[PDB]
């Protein structure tokens, strides 16, 4: 089937200057080979039409956001970049073509600026994703008691279409991220030997404990985009991309 739970993690593969992302609803002008480089005042996105120009370095174009990134933890989607403004628990929607902020949303009640960050720590309050079901922010509150929150955004307006308060603690994993509606989150142990350790199944509300092998290589929070589109995680450890092979049930 298309979905199901997530039941194996293949070993981490590195991928031949910046987090890059690309587009898991490419929308004309944009294709699926379309690919944007957020450069590490985190301020400019290079945008390549080609790999070819990707890989052959040669931006196409670059984008001038009206304010920077409190992390790499964005996303883009349906030809938007959507992003947490630094300092602040705002969601800015960032329209790549037109260069327009097309919508802004206070995460209501959001931990920012290292109140709930992952257990390596940094800026990691508050995380985009997308999934097949499409996009979701993942943060806590105080009202939560730092356990996981994950909201089902409209990607049009941001509003929070549904949300769901989880029983895991934010600050007691290292990642998370959301396949087929269902949240997962990364052990943080010392090993390289992590786990996903835990699954919240958005559609049911059921939530149990998972012992699947993670390979991680760096004690550092991690920045994880899985990709619909592809079927596969991927990762930036600040050194390199990398890609995980999935298999669900
Ligand atoms: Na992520």
């Given at each position: 089937?298309?979905?199901?739970?997530?039941?194996?993690?293949?070993?981490?593969?590195?991928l031949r200057y910046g987090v890059w992302?690309?587009?898991?609803?490419?929308?004309?002008?944009?294709?699926?080979?379309?690919t944007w480089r957020i450069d590490?005042?985190?301020?400019q996105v290079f945008e390549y039409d080609l790999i070819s120009q990707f890989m052959q370095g040669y931006p196409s174009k670059v984008?001038?956001?009206?304010?920077?990134?409190?992390?790499?933890?964005?996303?883009?989607?349906?030809?938007?970049?959507?992003?947490?403004?630094?300092?602040?628990?705002?969601?800015?929607?960032?329209?790549?073509?037109?260069?327009?902020?097309?919508?802004?949303?206070?995460?209501?009640?959001?931990?920012?600026?290292?109140?709930?960050?992952?257990?390596?720590?940094?800026?990691?309050?508050?995380?985009?994703?997308?999934?097949?079901?499409?996009?979701?922010?993942?943060?806590?509150?105080?009202?939560?008691?730092?356990?996981?929150?994950?909201?089902?955004?409209?990607?049009?307006?941001?509003?929070?279409?549904?949300?769901?308060?989880?029983?895991?603690?934010?600050?007691?994993?290292?990642?998370?991220?959301?396949?087929?509606?269902?949240?997962?989150?990364?052990?943080?142990?010392?090993?390289?030997?992590?786990?996903?350790?835990?699954?919240?199944?958005?559609?049911?509300?059921?939530?149990?404990?998972?012992?699947?092998?993670?390979?991680?290589?760096?004690?550092?929070?991690?920045?994880?985009?899985?990709?619909?589109?592809?079927?596969?995680?991927?990762?930036?450890?600040?050194?390199?991309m990398?890609?995980?092979?999935?298999?669900?049930?």
């Amino acid at each position: 089937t298309g979905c199901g739970e997530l039941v194996w993690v293949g070993e981490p593969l590195t991928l031949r200057y910046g987090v890059w992302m690309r587009d898991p609803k490419p929308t004309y002008p944009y294709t699926q080979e379309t690919t944007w480089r957020i450069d590490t005042d985190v301020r400019q996105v290079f945008e390549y039409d080609l790999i070819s120009q990707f890989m052959q370095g040669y931006p196409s174009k670059v984008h001038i956001l009206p304010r920077p990134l409190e992390s790499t933890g964005a996303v883009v989607y349906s030809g938007s970049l959507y992003f947490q403004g630094a300092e602040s628990r705002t969601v800015i929607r960032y329209e790549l073509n037109t260069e327009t902020v097309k919508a802004e949303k206070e995460i209501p009640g959001a931990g920012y600026h290292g109140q709930f960050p992952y257990s390596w720590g940094g800026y990691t309050d508050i995380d985009l994703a997308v999934d097949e079901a499409g996009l979701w922010v993942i943060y806590s509150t105080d009202e939560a008691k730092g356990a996981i929150v994950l909201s089902k955004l409209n990607p049009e307006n941001l509003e929070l279409e549904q949300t769901w308060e989880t029983n895991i603690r934010k600050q007691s994993v290292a990642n998370a991220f959301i396949i087929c509606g269902t949240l997962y989150t990364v052990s943080s142990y010392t090993s390289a030997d992590a786990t996903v350790n835990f699954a919240y199944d958005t559609g049911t509300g059921i939530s149990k404990t998972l012992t699947i092998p993670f390979k991680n290589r760096y004690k550092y929070s991690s920045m994880i985009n899985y990709n619909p589109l592809e079927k596969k995680l991927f990762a930036w450890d600040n050194l390199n991309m990398v890609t995980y092979d999935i298999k669900l049930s």
